[model samples]
Target: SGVEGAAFQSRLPHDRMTSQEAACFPDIISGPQQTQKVFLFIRNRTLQLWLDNPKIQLTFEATLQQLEAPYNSDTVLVHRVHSYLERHGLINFGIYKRIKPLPTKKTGKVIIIGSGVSGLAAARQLQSFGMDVTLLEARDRVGGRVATFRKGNYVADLGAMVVTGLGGNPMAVVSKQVNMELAKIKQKCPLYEANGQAVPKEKDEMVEQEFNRLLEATSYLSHQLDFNVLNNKPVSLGQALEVVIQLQEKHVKDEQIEHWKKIVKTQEELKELLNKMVNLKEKIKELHQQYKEADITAEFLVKSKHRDLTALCKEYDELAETQGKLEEKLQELEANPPSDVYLSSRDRQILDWHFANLEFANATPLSTLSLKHWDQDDDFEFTGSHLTVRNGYSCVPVALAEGLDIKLNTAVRQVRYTASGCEVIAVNTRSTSQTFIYKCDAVLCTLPLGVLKQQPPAVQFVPPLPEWKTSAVQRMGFGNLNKVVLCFDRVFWDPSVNLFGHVGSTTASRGELFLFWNLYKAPILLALVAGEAAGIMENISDDVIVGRCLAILKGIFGSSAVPQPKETVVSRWRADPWARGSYSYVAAGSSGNDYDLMAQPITPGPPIPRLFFAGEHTIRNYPATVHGALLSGLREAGRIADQFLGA
Candidate 1:
């Protein structure tokens, strides 16, 4: 009886005494002299239990009397178990469960590539429209420019910083639903020294008063600007001077003139008095000349002297009053900048008008670009000569595009579109390459124009594209955009100025690597670079860019007050082959017509809608914006749906 029982006990661990002893214990550890085998079995059993379920590590440790033995056993077992899990594709079991299969119904499959904001929104909308859609994303994640990553407890927005607003916009609508709060950032403060004292705050007030004086002076000086004046346009300085003399002679009174002349003659003594009356000795010589020329009648001479004297007194009074008040205000502001430096909203509105029109030397193509989308409400139909996405912004559109089926680990190496269908060749990380042939009644190709131009290997066409399509694709090329972010450990700028007009120097005048200091957490500075310059900067060394930015900070904010940076990130749109220069720019003369050419939709040999295209560059009115891309995609989706699915 013990032979069979002992053999069975030899196979189990000592810790399973409860399950084993309760069920098959009689022979599980049969030898009394070798009963130590029971403890060994139990220890081994407990170790394996913890290995299978790590969450129960504590529970297993508590029950084992000799915890040290079991804990040691678990350490060795865990390493082996984890290695096994990885080798067998079980490392990401939790995430694998989330991966869903595409709906394979009789209905046609809609493939929307590019997971950017535009693609996402289109996907979401199409899903709502009950269309069977599949989305292909080049990157692992969605939200092209709206990616928000978590760092410790803080959220670092690595992409688009804001959902632009116009009163209540679509982003606002989404924000409310998602419980996101929007706050306008405050302005930056400027510091300066004046009158042998540091006056950080009164710089603005000083500037305002200086501006006011300049405006008054310039108003009078504007008439004097024309040296060779156009009579129909303006009078020359000589002509204006003669007119002034005539007016003075006609209107001036003798008593008034004599009073002013005397005042002018004596006012020169104020400076001499301030200088300890050193000029008194020289004044006797001037008096002799005046006595010799006494023939210039006292009536005219006296009047002129008095007139000069009165003007001197008026200037002295005004100078003393203005300088005294200004110095006092400056001192007060230096002690407390906030009280004097801030602009009223009304003043800010006025300043924005003036500042917005101030031309930048190296203007961004973005600033000059305009977009016109097909779906824009007539009001929003306004085209930028480059357009930026409005309303739900890019994120909303991206979310919609993501609603379609997404296949991961599929790297598209080639793409070929036909009159009837398209083929895509992709290889996964495993190096398993596959060619996927998609036959759609009508195909809508919305890949970034640059990516399509790659001429990927797997590209094929059923009926070759006509010359028109080829010419359009060949005529256009993509550019790159780079965005660099610098994070400082502390905010060094004043909280009063929200946006800087010129930091160190004008944006146009500065080189490609410039910084826009934003008042976000940690005092972030953003720099945007696009096109040829973008391509070049993207390839530059990180240390070089960092040094450049630090140099700028030192120049704008005093070197002694320079801040420590917590982080530095540089983005290059050019490096990303998929997105060439941000959206697309209409070259100087190529804008209107080129845009029209790109926007022409592809239809069948006759009128039937066959192959189609939509994206930022697809619509003349809405070229180069996410809204334009999204609307164009939605328009195509609707046309396809109405024709095929009655969406």
Candidate 2:
């Protein structure tokens, strides 16, 4: 049309940006918004790189550093690029989202162990490869521990609730695909004291400020020995705390001695302050009169004294009242001091808060958790608002299971495998007499680690799992995260407050009423009890649990204001025969290598690997999460495809 011929011209907007145009862009672009734009531009230009070279790698950190963007932007940009590429058939991010049909050498039947997220995901993905896939779920329902109980329009997730984060997460992707109604939970968390009042803003700020100060002080002490002891060995948290506190107390004691030295100009003044029989009250009264006569404010009077006289006076009063408490403390420190390091009231409160937060996040107590390797999975970071599926989490498996074969009430009793194929023997739980045997080319065992770790064993393998696999299971920790959903006639909490916690009177009671989530202000409160508390709560009756929650409510709200709930539901994940616990975790002193070991399929002799393991426990980075389960399934499916389907 442009070759000097009389032709009809068409109008279209020139929407593409050239390099020069991009270079000449005037505005200062920075932060996540700018990084996202730049990432999309690079991704669009380099789309063919991912398509042509599936092995192409992009270090998000290097890219973000080049852009001079914040480090957190790495996750956001990587998530964007990953979603774009995976959606456009350039790459697969697992979770059963395949770009194109995989090439298969021979189509064969495959049996999946459980109908949980992992099993459903593997079933869906394997069936997409033209393989016969069958899912055997022990439970009567399809979705395993991802249970959702609905009352009319109100939905409460008794198991998994939020799709943790939106950064390249499979749950986020599938929720979008299914048009699942999602809502971001408000993050207004309020801490209440035992007095049934919101903690004063200043007190909270002071607590946080003191906490930071303690951390900074402890950091200097922690570096003294290069984290090594007298024998050049590592230390436990207890040992470290003891040493840190002792060193800090010694420094504080020396500083206090110097301060008192300045205050007491003579030994007579020190004697007068320390003696129990001295009438220092008259002297203090005389000083007050002098201060009053100066016509200055009390604060200015204290400022002129070069010290907080009020604090000094208070300390003196405390020492006088105790009549040798400080002297006794010093004597104790000198005489066979078993442990000179001790926590102050403020320090103890901070420790309690931290302990509560640890249990809240990990669903395990500090004693069982390893702080060293706890945060290694931060590489798969989660940010943005946590969202809950309005329909339910079960919608994920339901959508993924469309056109796939799933058998409910079927429990696999034994899994036998050979080099080429495997046999699965399952009995229908509804009728114990009814049994079925299926010969499949490969088997994906997606049972929970708790089930795999059972004493009697839920699914018995022919030759038993390899020692390494079983050892990994043993090293891993399975914890209970039970929830008590109480539905009231009216919402008693503040409408804006989504989360509220009660600072218990003692550390033992601190995590008893650990966490509370207000569900859309829908007269429903979801209370979470983890670790030993969850185990204890699981044993109690539903009425007792409801009473406990109501008592907590009474403590937070008021004795008179707390209303009776119309209904109550308690989750006993620990007691469930199929899933003995909620999810998997790397125990203290253990690392992600255990998860890697669990993920390894049994390849004793291989024309095609007969047995594969897939579950949340088998994933290292994304353990104790639905995405972990989903990705583990997709991972095993990919392994099988690579074994029998070539590419």
Candidate 3:
């Protein structure tokens, strides 16, 4: 198996050679193609730095993959990120083992709860080690949140959609093993105003450029200041971002006005230059005629006039170039926007669009996220294109669960654990009072962070989980990200671009109906609903929500252009009983170390670890990814095997 999690081999492009040689090895698929000049990641030297540096705290490599180069040029984007991490200052910032046949460990019975990516991954792994492992899932189906809904040719991944990054990603290796075909997502998220007009490229670039700088500066503020020392005052990614945006607007406006002022001064000087050129040209024309008649006095006068004409023309040409640049910059500004007031009305929408997308990626609102540790997972990110499966994301889970002893519709109600063994009480969902119990040597709980956040929790731990476990569960962040997927009568928006964005009509509506994703595989559109907006969606019925989405489509592409969706698929991860929410994030007042604390194994009896955990939320460097959960399963498997084999 090509599991990079087993070893720490670099997955990004190496910083050498014109071809970006030895950047990475190819899988069934690979990243940026120089064959198409798709642009190499290491071509930009700024993002290239700190790759080998032992002192750098936050790595730009992870963030680099998130953004595509503007016009296939990574320079602007690469430097935009490097500049931020550079000024933020230095901050204080696992290996794989193999599974061998365990003849001695045969009598051990391991029960893994919640058959998610982590649960199945751990179950299959332990089974390979010759240990008897049983998998339990509450849902009638095997795949937990990795469920898919297929209607005719229109298929929807009801839970997770794409495998985030491919390079060195465990899912990449897993997909090849399962024979899943993945299609690469194109980078074409077009920004549109409330009126349906697409924002200009120059304006989008201007706002995106500034927004990147603003985010970088926010990191600096969060890292340098100790908000916790101040009792966590205004502690959120939103709070820090607004602080930077305040300064960004002030400085950016000053420069914008400064450019406008130059435009005025240059216009005046340009007028004077034009006037002189006009008069000089007329004299030169008359002098040329005199020189043709060979009159000595007229000839000398003609030569002098010609010389004056040349000088005026030079002056005019230079001034015109200056005037042109000033005018173009002004146009870029007018075309772009900010401010909830600082930017142009149109530019503000683009900024909103960016925030909305970020929320979807984090699966939480900026206000609820930790500014101090929001990007804590960037250092170890796998570099490459985000890909969706040819069928659906559920295929990977289905493939892994094959041949394993899995019990569907079996909900684990309680777990009572001690030194060497544990009791797991499960209830069959089909009946009212049919409860079953499994006694195992150890229990690996792979419940989602949101489920663990439940009051009394979905599953109760007897002797109540140690204070260390309970504190970490509450402190670590977990939130939901639901989707509104619609298959239309036709491709109304341009099929060339895969992404579309909408600016909220009001402040509270900012994140609502914010981002639209068009799936080329089918006439499908997925409207990403993130954070607080997702909660708001929790109460709304499907028809009403779909109607709201229909209106947005009509607004962005016009009522005539958009047709009623032929069919609709909606997901309310927040409301789902099995999955209380979508994913996890580093909440305000929590550090990245919280992930480590939550993942620690519990020892109810002296010196023997009995209770273990593994999920996307458990790992520190790579949380909120399918591979993140996949790798955590492998990590715990190694831990358990070591305990028995005495490694």
Candidate 4:
């Protein structure tokens, strides 16, 4: 009914305020609840901008509505709206749902590498453009990062989740067109208490006032070179504050010395109390375990008629009384810290005293709310937000190839893009490598960026890829994101705590160690290990990951209840030779800019333009996304189609 120990009680219905109804905090209007509104506006704007185009004209209103329904939190409504759009054959999110690809050029055989979202969409687009396309998948199956695994009745997405906030991609538009249900997650921000300490998300209003008063004393303090709250090395934020207070009060040597003595007195008292509390907690835990184990021992003792049981019980009773008194004192101390005298003083005494004990301090000069760190508090959720197709990010590629004929499972070993045409060597499970020479106008190489980077042994180009393109490929960094899907018999976390993220001085990697909890029907939890940590973890066995997850369970929740996940799924895309690393990233100092080189196609000279490239990795703007890849593929198809028309 409530969070364990009633941590967070549900706000009353009256407490919920709509955007228009909200007062001062206007940000709350579009907070987490307005994902639908934002998605709608984005779709509307994109459609308005591209609606008049003669080439890609399509209706997106109905599809946008379908995709936005999921974010409404009404899954049934989302399904209903989405099902209706799908049944009508209105598939793509371009303009209207299902617009068949209009081929402009003669049927040309095109080869696409990688089965990821972008690659698939490219092939699909070319096929729709009335071309014969062959899609090569380096991995075992398709769906790329959008791949889904069935866990019980629901599906657990192991790769990228969530549609991005900025919505110009053909993928998002197409997803809307296809009536894919788009949903937004709800989040809660609250002050947290843990391990007998209250660490608030924000200082209380009363504390803020006291802090403001403390700030007013800043001018009274002497210059003493540099004396900012966060920066100056000689004086830490705490020391600076104390100095400011002393100067404002006009305390001399006697008073300053007395002040220091008083501060020491306060700290020593706290350290002793904390040490005792820490010991008290351990003793209490021991007593609790003894109580739990007593029944077993009592039965044995009564059967053996041992006298030690009585003595042990009496000794435990005295210890329990002492523990109760100590616990009450500890609670009293927590309820009223020494700093409580200041309307709302921080309970940071423990932290401050501990730091003082360690002689630890920060030299980062700071103001009330350092304007520099203000961006952290800004409403910029959409900056790095992104989304992929639900059915699979490959939906775009598959849709693009609708009109063009395509062959799957054909692994291309060699490509000869000559002046006359092109020769492709491919092998399938049923047949040996067959060299097929076709006189084509040009070629589009839609292989993944990483594939081009390492230049794997399986495929060879007759004429090497341009140095510029190769350099661009080499420069792009591929990130590794490892996901572990844990399926439990039931949901362990409350709905309010649906998602989880990590931040700390201690880090395994940049984005690793963070987890996203899915509150769908399956009650699945997907944990991610990104960047270098993911690479390190990929080397570990499945059993090790499971063991780590178990430890995480113990840490998150005291043994009262722990989830024993029924299944675990691990992905090592980064380690796979085919995908040397996960999706591409911008290296710190590399020239990975892909604007022009990404769009260029390698092909037979001016005479024939048959082969082409199309995939997320190939699209500069939409790289690493289904939409970008689909658009790139469509652009290639259009280019070839235009070339054929000119011929």
* lDDT of every predicted structure (CA atoms): 0.45, 0.67, 0.71, 0.49
| Model 2 per-residue lDDT at 296 | 61
Clashes of 1: 65
Of candidates 3 and 2, the better by lDDT = 3
Error of 4 at 502 (Å): 4.3
Residue 244, candidate 2: Cα error in Å is 5.0
TM-score of each prediction? 0.51, 0.71, 0.72, 0.55
Encode model 3's per-residue lDDT on 1-647: one tens digit a residue: 12122222234333322322332223201544552232333233333233222232333544465344552255554544343323211110011112232355474788899898888877766665568889988989876778788888887786788877776576655665576788888887887777767778898899898779878777777776555224535378887777777886787678777766766675666577667667766766775565555578776777786676676667657766766775676566555543234677667767877787788888888888887788887888776888877588888888778777999999999999987589999999999399999999889999988888899678999869877778888988887788888986678778877678876655555777788877646788888887578888878888898998888888777788877888887888888888888888889878889899878988885578888899989989788777778778877776676565444
Cα-lDDT of candidate 3: 0.71
Winner on TM-score (1 vs 3): 3
Q: Candidate 2: list runs displaced more than 4 Å.
A: 1-106, 209-350, 605-607
Candidate 2 lDDT over 163-187, as tens digits, reads 7766445565566555667778887
* Model 3, TM vs. native: 0.72
Error of 4 at 127 (Å): 3.7
Q: Across residues 393-488, which tens digit of lDDT does each residue of candidate 4 receive?
A: 334334444443344556566777776666776666345555444334455666655566664555777777667666766655455566787777
User: How many residue pairs collide in each prediction?
Assistant: 65, 0, 9, 49
Backbone clash total for model 3 is 9
Candidate 4 wrongly placed segments (more than 4 Å): 1-105, 189-404, 429-440, 455-458, 502-505, 508-512, 603-612
Highest TM-score against the true fold, candidate: 3
**Candidate 1 lDDT score relative to the true structure:** 0.45
